From a paper:
Artemis nuclease and DNA-dependent protein kinase catalytic subunit (DNA-PKcs) are key components in nonhomologous DNA end joining (NHEJ), the major repair mechanism for double-strand DNA breaks. Artemis (692 aa) consists of a catalytic domain (1–360 aa), composed of the MβL and β-CASP (CPSF-73-Artemis-SNM1-Pso2) subdomains, and an unstructured C-terminal regulatory tail (361–692 aa). Even without DNA damage, Artemis exists primarily in a complex with DNA-PKcs.
This is the state of the complex after purification, but prior to, activation with ATP and a DNA end and presumably the state that would be present in the cell before the complex is recruited to broken DNA ends. Among the three states, the state 2 map had the best resolved tail density and the strongest signal of the catalytic domain and was therefore selected for further refinement and modeling of Artemis bound to DNA-PKcs. All three states possess density attributable to the flexible C-terminal tail of Artemis (K368–Y407) bound to the FAT domains of DNA-PKcs. The N-terminal catalytic domain of Artemis is dynamic, even in complex with DNA-PKcs in this basal state. Contact point 2 occurs between positively charged residues of the FR3 domain (∼3252–∼3309 aa) and Artemis residues (D389–P396) (number 2, and 4D) and includes a sharp bend down toward the catalytic domain. Contact point 3 is another negatively charged region in the FR2 region of the FAT domain (∼3057–∼3098 aa) and the positively charged residues (K368–R379) of Artemis interact with the surface of this region.
Numbering used by the authors:
A (entry chain C): 362 to 413
B (entry chain A): 3727 to 4128
C (entry chain A): 606 to 805, 845 to 1108
D (entry chain A): 2519 to 2608, 2760 to 3524
Write the structure that this text describes.
């Protein structure tokens, strides 16, 4: 526990929630009613650039 | 006060019991039921634009004034305050040296156009345009029109807006409002088939930069079907309007406004199409009223004898309006109007070719005749409006140079 | 035309006694929760309203009535009288009669307050905006302009701003949304005017905080009306150039060259500072610079141009400047007044001269004076314009020769015809301006015997 | 004054009146940026008095003869306040030595005095310039322009070029070395650079940064456009210079102009700039078209396809196009509320390793401006939705350990800090952050010009959100509201009565408001849990909940009300998104609500109707085959007995479902009629389903169309009969009349379109079944006009045309039914009614014209 002497009170973590499992694994019965899922976004540029 | 314009109307001020003054324009010997019906059509258009989210987020509304007929030969028209004619603004922007040379000077574009018509056609009347249509080539017309455009200052609208404004923010606001108003006016006039858009038919609001359209005499291709010199243009997008957005192109703000307005109009066309159907089938809109109206005013000098003859069919006008409110090519529509009106002419083929294009420099000739999207339709409209081949063969009073 | 002008109490001690009594009643009366004030609401309100009706120029009656209406609301006195004449008196006719009397007095005060100013106005606005929400729910419109004036004056006078904020909050909370919806576009622009000053008695920081919270609590479907006035009409104005060309060319001297600057780009901000500046030093500097530029304009106009062209037309510039000079010559200040009143008199004398006559400059000056004399807000400017019309006629009839008057604008006949037109205008303030003008001319009018014998019957019929 | 005379002395300020401008340009420090214009103007005008033309009078001649008297001096009294005092009634510790000073002199006369000293204009000009930044700005600009124009006459070309280069370097130094960013100073510098030519080569990056900091975007935009127009740096596309890495100078100016236009909020100009100048590929045009069509899914897909593509036949795209693609894909993912994608995209380019190091956000200025807000927003949204992750919070605490990072976090993301703390309890501190956010809103709104509408609208939406944040904080900070149910009821009623604009607010405002409200409801549900750690212990301990389950059975505990409010708010958001033509977001929210919609009959039927409405709106802008597929998905949910059981209980939902099913059938039939072989164009299962739904024994392309039209008419007539059959009270003032009007107009429009279709093309079939169409149109349109429908009022003349075409079917019907419509509903078409008086079919309008003549 590190509340700290000053105002910041930086929080190490969050007591609230932290629930491990959320929502049914089923995740909505009808595939037909809703449209196919958008492709997952992909990006692979070169890092360590100067003023990109 | 007597207004210096055609038919010489007069301006009176009425003091109401609400302790306010109401200026009005008194027009005598001029039926004005068509103007009232067109204003009602614009009100319906304004409602449809207001009920659309994309246009509501940009506040696209056509400025509508009041037209009231009291007699079949006399009526009252609301007078707009702090407004000026676009031609008057362009003329007053020019200096004394510039104004005298365009206004009164040999080799001026107003005189070079007539000299060129005499050169390519041994006539000094309305048949010179027909002979030039039959006897001129695209390259010559384009080169002559560009050389004629080069003789008029290229930043008249920009200089005027700079002179009125005091800060760059005011200049930005005025230019944006002018561009948006002009784009909305252009698309709404093309939907209604309104022609005869010369520089004296536009009024500029000098306090905010807005544009207002007046003097609606032609409707549903009347300038393309019944004039001795046909108008093959959807709206007025000339060199000055292009140069107003000096670093940018017309494919930005104006294109976006026109596309959004056309998309709003094309969604649920039933109300609009029904209103123009009620407009087009009227017992007071006979061919006699049209010929009296076109006879009273000069225009393209329709004369006491009409070559195109009476071909008044309200079913064809509403059919063309419904077709263009769906995916349709503007070149196809104007060629259809030319076929309906100018069939017995010696320059029919040249009319059709000029109005259609060449498939090498025009995007409207590379597209199908129907099923166009809104973006493609607006692109074809802009290409047909800015075509030097069409603009180099127009009526002298239209002034295609400015 | 101002009612509370050149008027003094007959007994100055009685006014001091009344002021002390009102100030004492501010502290003593609202005490004890007003449980004991229950049987005195009608007996206080009737007498106070009668005395205020008999003497409408005393703010103490309005303040006492304000305390009366405030104590009643804690009591709840007007929670069941909204049906009004639908039922005669289910519980008590005293409350119904008090309600009806309160309704009529407030509507009359709102109608009569449009000519008051300063302390009397602040008290009337407080009294009307302290009214219960049922009376406002009757007719919203007569009370709207009161809210607008209270907010506008609260941009500089904090208690009026607080009163207007409380009234707006009460109206938005308790009055039905359907009836209050159309009026928000008239109310929110002055809150925007409050918000624009955030770049620079409850301090204004908490007032702006309350304005922000009120805007947020209204909702996105309403607070957009905060931008209704802007980007339309006047807001575009004063953003346009006074003249499309440049007239005042000034050559700044140096020992080597003479660069040319234009003083017509400074004119709008200089006039704005000379008219409304909080700090006194910048106001004095702006007034002096405006005087110098008026002298420069007059000299440049009167100077014979060296070039082959004609004299530089200063019509547009004179027309914008002449109205500002008229406003400045009747300022609440005295340095501005004694600096600019002789300027206006000298300008009238010069434009009525033999040299500068039958021109659009005299026309511009005369139309500026005649437009100022029909000001529906400022009465001091109206008085000053009446005095300007007298001086104009007095120096017009003397300087000019007996000849050189046929087919000549800006003459006695023409001035009378403009006054006659003003007198027959259906607008109330035009007739008032014409009457004030004639009341300022008649001394000079009666002296000219030849002018009388042709201008008495027509004027009598016109004014009847 | 001593320092001023020291600096104005010779050998420290040359008196050649041209090198003095350069000397004043060199005599500049960022500390005195506020008063620099007044200082420079005073230094320039102080040498005017050394000229021989200074003391002598300016105008040599008076206007006329006027003898001036002795100098009149105003009475310099002590000013007093009079606005706050009793009226009709009958200390100056530092004001007495700070009284009003005066310049020049005056002389009274019967004419104005124009023979004034030449100093009488110079002295007050500088006097008022010292006390006003705007006047000093104008004076400095005018003096600079005049000195430059006059030096043009007395200099050679090489010297002019040298001094212009020196001025350009000085202005670049001014724009690059500043921290106060005084709006008059940057505006003056940029305007002076704009009105000249050799100064048009000013550095675009410094101009953009200064205009972004000081909010002089119009000035920067004007400078950039005149730089693009008048300079003409290079017009050779063949790249005659040797090939190297650096981007072209013109496209840098285009990028800066686009940045300024995006900051000012004009997205159409930005789209045009990216279309015509930045874009050099074909995928870019289609992506921009999709973005302008509000189809963010397709635009994002095309942006990712362009970014991962590794082989280009035409050539490698420029770096500007690639960064525009990345930024536009970030904007598209933000618009779609795809937080998990937005967070990746934002954190993708920081590191090549699988876990990104967030500290490198604070490394480059480019990373801070384009990735930080998106990353913060995505992580905050993911946390507020209920997911658990500490990355954002660890980043926040480690950043506020510093001072520059903490300052620039507090400057902008104060609301995010408030929400982040309020999540992790800390109710006491978050008030400080929300007050800072409100104050920053005040500053930002007050720093924007009044001619820019979009920015002020955006700030209005922002302050709405901030005020709701503060209101919830105030509600939760008091323990009295936790007890009982009246404060929760008040808050719920206020929240459901306070909504963003459906037609005028973007989806970001709705998303923020809805997410914050749902988070607040989750927090108030967590706080109002039973006090013992085991559920229902206190409930069985006390006796009140036992009797509340019997008497108060009408509603349930706070959980049910919270769930109902959440469902209603999310449905309102779904309808708003459907109205704003954002279909992917509406589909996402509809699925997310479907997860739990099937627990109550009214919730289920509301979900089904909203889905069908969204699909109907989606079908409009698609082809015939896509139309058929969309409404074929739609049609499977409106013919189910499980929901028909509830439809038998409520008559309004039955009418709405019948209307929706009739609309679906009409769409199917219209799509089939406008495109033959469309059924053959789709797979056999869908064609067989359409054949079964048609109900026609034949297998041709016309009997199916006729059957679908018959089913559509049957459903619309069933809906109108359900509406008419005493489905509601009379309901004055047209409260619930919207559904009845909708049914009337739907049936009337369907029958009217069918009647129009018969008139256009020549008819060979008898079509005897259409005898009931025109009377139906006239009658139902007349009831709709009675119910105050604007659409019927603008569709009135069609009824007169129908009367003319088919007299004996409906002339008497209209004559009987038109007599009950209010007379003032025919004022718009008064000309037609008075022009339809000498015809045979005039009996209908006689009563109407007599009524309006009487009124």
């Amino acid at each position: 526990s590190q509340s700290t002497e000053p105002k910041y009170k930086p929080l190490g973590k969050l007591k609230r929630a932290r629930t491990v499992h959320r929502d049914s694994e089923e995740e909505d019965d009808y595939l037909f009613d809703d449209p196919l899922p958008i492709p997952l976004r992909h990006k692979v540029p070169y890092p360590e650039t100067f003023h990109p | 006060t007597v207004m210096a314009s055609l038919r010489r109307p007069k301006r009176i001020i009425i003091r109401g019991h609400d302790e306010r003054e109401h200026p009005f324009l008194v027009k005598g010997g001029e039926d004005l039921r068509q103007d009232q019906r067109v204003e009602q059509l614009f009100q319906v258009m304004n409602g449809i634009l207001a009920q659309d989210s994309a246009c509501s987020q940009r506040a696209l509304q056509l400025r509508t004034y009041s037209v009231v007929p009291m007699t079949s030969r006399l009526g009252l028209i609301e007078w707009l305050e702090n407004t000026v004619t676009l031609k008057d603004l362009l003329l007053n922007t020019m200096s004394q040296e510039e104004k005298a040379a365009y206004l009164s000077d040999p080799r001026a574009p107003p005189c070079e156009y007539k000299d060129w018509l005499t050169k390519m056609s041994g006539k000094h009347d309305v048949g010179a345009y027909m002979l030039m249509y039959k006897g001129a080539n695209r390259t010559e017309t384009v080169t002559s029109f560009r050389k004629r455009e080069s003789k008029v200052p290229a930043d008249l609208l920009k200089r005027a807006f700079v002179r009125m404004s005091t800060s760059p923010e005011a200049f930005l606001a005025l230019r944006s409002h002018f561009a948006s108003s002009h784009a909305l006016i252009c698309i709404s006039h093309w939907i209604l088939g309104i022609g005869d858009r010369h520089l004296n038919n536009f009024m500029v609001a000098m306090e905010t930069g807005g544009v207002i359209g007046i003097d609606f005499g032609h409707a549903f291709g009347s300038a393309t079907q019944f004039l001795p010199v046909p108008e093959l243009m959807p709206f007025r997008l000339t060199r000055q309007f292009i140069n107003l957005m000096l670093p940018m192109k017309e494919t930005g703000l104006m294109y976006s406004i026109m596309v959004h307005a056309l998309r709003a109009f094309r969604s649920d066309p039933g109300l609009l199409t029904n209103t123009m159907d009620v407009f087009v089938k009227e017992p007071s809109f006979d061919w006699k009223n049209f010929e009296q109206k076109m006879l009273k005013k000069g225009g393209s000098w329709i004369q006491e004898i009409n070559v195109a003859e009476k071909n008044w069919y309200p079913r064809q006008k509403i059919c063309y309006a419904k077709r263009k409110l769906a995916g349709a090519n503007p070149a196809v529509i104007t060629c259809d109007e030319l076929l309906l009106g100018h069939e017995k002419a010696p320059a029919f083929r040249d009319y059709v070719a000029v109005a259609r294009g060449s498939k090498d420099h025009n995007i409207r000739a590379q597209e199908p005749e129907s099923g166009l999207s809104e973006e493609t339709q607006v692109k074809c409209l802009m290409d047909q409006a800015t075509d030097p081949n069409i603009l180099g063969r127009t009526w002298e009073g239209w002034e295609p140079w400015m | 035309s101002d009612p509370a002008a050149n008027l003094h109490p007959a007994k100055p001690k009685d006014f001091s006694a009344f002021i002390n009594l009102v100030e004492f009643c501010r502290e003593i009366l609202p005490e004890k929760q007003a449980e004991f004030f229950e049987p005195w609401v009608y007996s206080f309100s009737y007498e106070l309203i009668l005395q205020s009706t008999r003497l409408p120029l005393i703010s103490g009656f309005y303040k006492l009535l304000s305390i009366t209406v405030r104590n009643a609301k804690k009591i709840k006195y007007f929670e069941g009288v909204s049906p009004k004449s639908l039922k005669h008196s289910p519980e008590d006719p005293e409350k119904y009669s008090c309600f009806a009397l309160f309704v009529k007095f407030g509507k009359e005060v709102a109608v009569k307050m449009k000519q008051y100013k300063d302390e009397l106005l602040a008290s009337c606005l407080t009294f009307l905006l302290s009214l219960p929400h049922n009376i406002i729910e009757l007719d919203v419109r007569a009370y709207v302009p009161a809210l607008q004036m209270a907010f506008k004056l609260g941009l500089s006078y904090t208690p009026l701003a607080e009163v207007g904020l409380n009234a707006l909050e009460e109206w938005s909370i308790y009055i039905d949304r359907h009836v209050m919806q159309p009026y928000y576009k008239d109310i929110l622009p002055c809150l925007d005017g409050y918000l624009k000053t955030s770049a620079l008695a409850i301090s204004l920081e908490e007032i702006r905080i309350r304005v922000v919270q009120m805007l947020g609590s209204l909702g996105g479907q309403i607070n957009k009306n905060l931008l209704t006035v802007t980007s339309s009409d006047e807001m575009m104005k004063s953003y346009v150039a006074w003249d499309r060309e440049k007239r005042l060319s000034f050559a700044v001297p140096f020992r080597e060259m003479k660069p040319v600057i234009f003083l017509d780009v400074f004119l709008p901000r200089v006039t704005e500072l000379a008219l409304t500046a909080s700090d006194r030093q910048t106001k004095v500097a702006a007034c002096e610079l405006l005087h110098s530029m008026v002298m420069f304009m007059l000299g440049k106009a009167t100077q014979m141009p060296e070039g082959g062209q004609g004299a530089p037309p200063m019509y547009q510039l004179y027309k914008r400047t002449f109205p500002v000079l008229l406003r400045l010559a009747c300022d609440v200040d005295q340095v501005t007044r004694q600096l600019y009143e002789p300027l206006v008199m000298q300008l009238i004398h010069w434009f009525t001269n033999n040299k500068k006559f039958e021109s659009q400059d005299t026309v511009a000056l005369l139309e500026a004076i005649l437009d100022g004399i029909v000001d529906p807000v400022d009465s001091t400017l109206r008085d000053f314009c009446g005095r300007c019309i007298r001086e104009f006629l007095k120096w017009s009839i003397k300087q000019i020769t007996p000849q050189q008057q046929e087919k000549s604008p800006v003459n006695t006949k023409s001035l009378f015809k403009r006054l006659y037109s003003l007198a027959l205008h259906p607008n109330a303030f035009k007739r008032l301006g014409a009457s004030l003008a004639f009341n300022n001319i008649y001394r000079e009018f009666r002296e000219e015997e030849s002018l009388v014998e042709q201008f008495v019957f027509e004027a009598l019929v016109i004014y009847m | 004054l001593i320092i001023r005379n020291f600096w104005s002395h010779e050998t420290r300020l040359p008196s050649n009146t041209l090198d003095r401008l350069l000397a004043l340009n060199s005599l500049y420090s960022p500390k005195i940026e506020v008063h620099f214009l007044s200082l420079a103007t005073n230094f320039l005008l102080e040498m005017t008095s050394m000229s021989p033309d200074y003391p002598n009078p300016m105008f040599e001649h008076p206007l006329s003869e006027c003898e001036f008297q002795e100098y009149t001096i105003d009475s310099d009294w002590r000013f007093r306040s009079t606005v706050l005092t009793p009226m009709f009634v009958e200390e100056l510790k530092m004001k007495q030595d700070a009284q009003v000073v005066l310049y020049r002199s005056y002389r009274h006369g019967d004419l104005p005095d124009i023979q004034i000293k030449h100093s009488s204009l110079i002295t007050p000009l500088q006097a008022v310039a010292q006390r006003d930044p705007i006047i000093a700005k104008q004076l400095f600009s005018s003096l600079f322009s005049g000195i430059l124009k006059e030096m043009d006459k007395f200099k050679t070309l090489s010297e002019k070029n040298n001094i212009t280069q020196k001025l350009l370097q000085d202005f670049n130094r001014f724009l690059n070395t500043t921290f106060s960013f005084f709006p008059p100073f940057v505006s003056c510098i940029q305007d002076i650079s704009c009105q000249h030519a050799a100064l048009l080569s000013l550095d675009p990056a410094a101009v953009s940064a200064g205009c972004l900091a000081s909010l002089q975007q119009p000035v920067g935009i004007r400078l950039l456009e005149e730089a693009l127009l008048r300079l003409l740096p290079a017009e050779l596309p063949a790249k005659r210079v040797r090939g190297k890495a650096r981007l072209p100078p013109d496209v840098l100016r285009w990028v800066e102009l686009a940045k300024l236009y995006r900051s000012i909020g004009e997205y159409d100009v930005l789209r045009g700039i990216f279309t015509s100048e930045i874009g050099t590929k074909q995928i870019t045009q289609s992506a921009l078209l999709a973005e302008a069509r509000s189809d963010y899914s397709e635009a994002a897909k095309q942006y990712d396809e362009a970014l991962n593509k590794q082989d280009w036949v035409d050539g490698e795209p420029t770096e500007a196009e690639k960064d525009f693609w990345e930024l536009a894909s970030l904007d598209c993912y933000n618009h779609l509320a795809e937080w998990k994608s937005l967070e990746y995209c934002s954190t993708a380019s920081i590191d090549s390793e699988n876990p990104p190091d967030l500290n490198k956000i604070w490394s480059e200025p480019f990373y801070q401006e384009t990735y930080l807000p998106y990353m913060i927003r995505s992580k905050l949204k993911l946390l507020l939705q209920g997911e658990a992750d500490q990355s954002l919070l660890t980043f926040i605490d480690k950043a506020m350990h510093g001072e520059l990072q903490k300052a620039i976090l507090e400057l902008h993301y104060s609301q995010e800090l408030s929400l982040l703390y309020l999540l992790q309890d800390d109710v006491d501190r978050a008030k400080y952050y929300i007050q800072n956010g409100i104050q920053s809103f005040m500053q930002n709104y007050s720093s924007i010009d009044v001619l820019l509408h979009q920015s002020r609208l955006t700030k209005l939406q922002s302050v709405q959100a901030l005020t709701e944040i503060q209101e919830f904080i105030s509600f939760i900070s008091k323990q009295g509201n936790l007890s009982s149910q009246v404060p929760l009821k008040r808050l719920l009623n206020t929240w459901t009565n306070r909504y963003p604009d459906a037609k005028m607010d973007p989806m970001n405002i709705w998303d923020d408001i809805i997410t914050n409200r749902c988070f607040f409801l989750s927090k108030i549900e967590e706080k109002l849990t039973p006090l013992p750690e085991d559920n229902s212990m206190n409930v069985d301990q006390d006796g009140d909940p036992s009797d509340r389950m019997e008497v108060q059975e009408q509603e349930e505990d706070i959980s049910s009300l919270i769930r109902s409010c959440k469902f209603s708010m999310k449905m309102k958001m779904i309808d708003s998104a459907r109205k704003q033509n954002n279909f992917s977001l509406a589909m996402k929210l509809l699925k997310e609500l479907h997860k739990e919609s099937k627990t109550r009959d009214d919730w289920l039927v509301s979900w089904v109707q909203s889905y069908c409405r969204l699909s109907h709106c989606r079908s409009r802008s698609q082809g015939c085959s896509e139309q058929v597929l969309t409404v074929l998905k739609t049609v499977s949910l409106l013919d189910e007995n499980n929901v028909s059981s509830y439809l038998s209980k409520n008559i309004l939902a039955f009418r709405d479902q019948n209307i929706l099913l009739g609309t679906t059938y009409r769409i199917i039939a219209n799509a089939l009629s406008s495109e033959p072989a469309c059924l053959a164009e789709i797979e056999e299962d869908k064609a067989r389903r359409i054949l079964e739904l048609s109900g026609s024994s034949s297998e041709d392309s016309e009997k199916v169309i006729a059957g679908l039209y018959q089913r559509a008419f049957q459903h619309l007539s069933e809906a109108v009969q359900a509406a008419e059959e005493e489905a509601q009270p009379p309901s004055w003032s047209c409260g619930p009349a919207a559904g009845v009007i909708d049914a009337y107009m739907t049936l009337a429009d369907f029958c009217d379109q069918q009647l129009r279709k018969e008139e256009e093309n020549a008819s060979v079939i008898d079509s005897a079944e259409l005898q009931a169409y025109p009377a139906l149109v006239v009658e139902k349109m007349l009831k709709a006009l009675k119910l105050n429908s604007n659409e019927a009022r603008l569709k009135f003349p069609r009824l007169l045309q129908i009367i003319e075409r088919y007299p004996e079917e409906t002339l008497s019907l209209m004559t009987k039914e038109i007599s009950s419509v209010p007379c003032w509903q025919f004022i718009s078409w008064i000309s037609h009614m008075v022009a339809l008086l000498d015809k045979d079919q005039a009996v209908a309008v006689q009563h109407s014209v007599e009524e309006i003549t009487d009124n």
